[PDB]
Every structure is written in C-alpha cells, then in structure tokens.
Amino acid sequence: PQITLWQRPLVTIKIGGQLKEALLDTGADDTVLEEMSLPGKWKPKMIGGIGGFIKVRQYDQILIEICGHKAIGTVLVGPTPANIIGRNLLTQIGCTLNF
Amino acid sequence: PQITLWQRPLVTIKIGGQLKEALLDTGADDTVLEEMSLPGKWKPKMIGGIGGFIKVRQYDQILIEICGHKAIGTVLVGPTPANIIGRNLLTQIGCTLNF
Numbered sequence: 001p002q003i004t005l006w007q008r009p010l011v012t013i014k015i016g017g018q019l020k021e022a023l024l025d026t027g028a029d030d031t032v033l034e035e036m037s038l039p040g041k042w043k044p045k046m047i048g049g050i051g052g053f054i055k056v057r058q059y060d061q062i063l064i065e066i067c068g069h070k071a072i073g074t075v076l077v078g079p080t081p082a083n084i085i086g087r088n089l090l091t092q093i094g095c096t097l098n099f
Numbered sequence: 100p101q102i103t104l105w106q107r108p109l110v111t112i113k114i115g116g117q118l119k120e121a122l123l124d125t126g127a128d129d130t131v132l133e134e135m136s137l138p139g140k141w142k143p144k145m146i147g148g149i150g151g152f153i154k155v156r157q158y159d160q161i162l163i164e165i166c167g168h169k170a171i172g173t174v175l176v177g178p179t180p181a182n183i184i185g186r187n188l189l190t191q192i193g194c195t196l197n198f
C-alpha cells in the first residue's frame with residue numbers, strides 16, 4: 001500500500017508469535033523493538049540515537065511479518081520508547097520513498 | 100523521485116543560504132539539524148529519541164528547499180548526530196512510503 005505521512009507510519013507486525021505496532025522508519029539503520037519475549041541466543045549491543053546510546057539484545061535471523069510481508073533479519077530488543085522497523089527489514093518488504 | 104532503502108535516504112537541502120545533506124526520516128515527527136547558523140528568534144525546546152533527550156533551538160516558519168522542493172516549517176537546531184528531515188516537512192514535499 002501507499003502511505004502518506006500526515007500521521008505516524010504505523011503498521012502491525014507479528015514476531016515471536018506476538019502482535020505489535022511498529023513505526024516504518026527510513027531514518028533507522030536497524031530494527032529495534034520494546035522489551036519483549038523472544039527465543040534463542042542473543043548478544044549484547046549498543047545502538048545510538050538522538051539522545052545517546054542504549055543497551056539492547058541482538059537477535060539474528062528473526063522472522064517478522066510486517067503488514068502481511070514476511071522478512072528475516074536482525075532484531076534488537078531493549079529500552080526503546082517505540083518499536084522501530086529500520087532499513088534492514090524495510091528493504092526486504094520492498095519499501096520505497098517517493099516524492 | 101523514487102528512493103529505495105538499501106542506503107541511507109540522503110538528500111541535499113538548502114536552508115539559511117547553506118547547503119547540507121539530510122536524512123529523509125519517516126520515523127521522526129520533527130526536523131532537526133546539526134548546529135548551524137540561522138537568523139531570527141528561536142525558543143529553547145527539548146526533544147526525545149533513542150538514548151534520551153537533547154536541548155535544541157526551535158525556529159518556526161523556516162524556508163527549506165529539499166531536493167528541489169520548497170517548504171516552510173519548524174526546524175530544530177541542536178546536538179543531533181545527523182540532519183533529520185521529519186514528517187512535518189516530508190508531508191509538504193509530497194513524500195510517501197510504498198510497499
């Protein structure tokens with residue numbers, strides 16, 4: 001679908017058998033989700049943002065279904081104020097910017 | 100133009116008579132630029148993001164030309180790690196997400 005930006009570009013995703021709303025974020029290199037229950041091994045990692053850095057858990061090869069499109073990639077889980085779908089997954093669902 | 104997301108969606112903008120490169124960021128409500136010289140009155144504001152918050156100067160009714168498209172709006176200036184063009188301006192240049 002085509003999405004205008006008068007409102008936050010939120011979509012529904014299913015990951016780890018759970019449903020969540022996430023922001024389609026072209027400015028983010030990575031995908032980071034709020035604290036949630038995911039299975040498997042993970043490594044410690046630090047990512048930066050507008051106000052500094054936060055520590056998160058890195059899960060690789062995680063399956064995510066974004067607005068009906070499946071994608072597998074790295075997902076970070078930590079103290080983010082909102083669920084963000086970054087470019088590593090946006091490219092997989094064929095998301096583009098147009099103007 | 101149409102922009103895929105395998106690389107950061109950077110565009111050239113002209114603001115305050117200066118040329119800068121900025122990120123088309125669908126996840127940002129606001130537009131924030133690294134410290135720069137802008138004329139006029141401004142109001143101290145506080146914005147948040149990953150990592151916490153930063154203090155910025157708020158300039159309203161600022162003329163900005165993004166990749167050839169003119170737009171007038173609020174622009175925040177402060178210790179941001181990168182120039183961000185948020186939805187407040189993306190809507191003005193008719194930018195949409197597609198997938």
Ligand SMILES: CC(C)[C@H](NC(=O)N(C)Cc1ccccn1)C(=O)N[C@@H](Cc1ccccc1)[C@H](O)[C@@H](O)[C@H](CC1CCCCC1)NC(=O)[C@@H](NC(=O)N(C)Cc1ccccn1)C(C)C
Nearest residue numbers: 027028029047048049050081082126127128147148149180
């Ligand atoms: C998630 C992070 C992994 C990501 N960091 C990176 O990708 N980096 C460091 C590599 C890099 C380097 C250079 C250029 C691009 N990328 C990030 O935080 N990306 C934000 C943009 C950014 C990029 C680089 C430095 C600083 C900032 C992200 O893409 C923005 O869209 C971000 C999303 C926001 C949503 C919920 C609250 C935390 C994260 N927007 C902002 O930080 C923005 N904040 C808001 O818009 N807020 C707080 C309102 C809001 C609430 C809820 C939903 C949407 N907006 C600031 C005013 C700039």
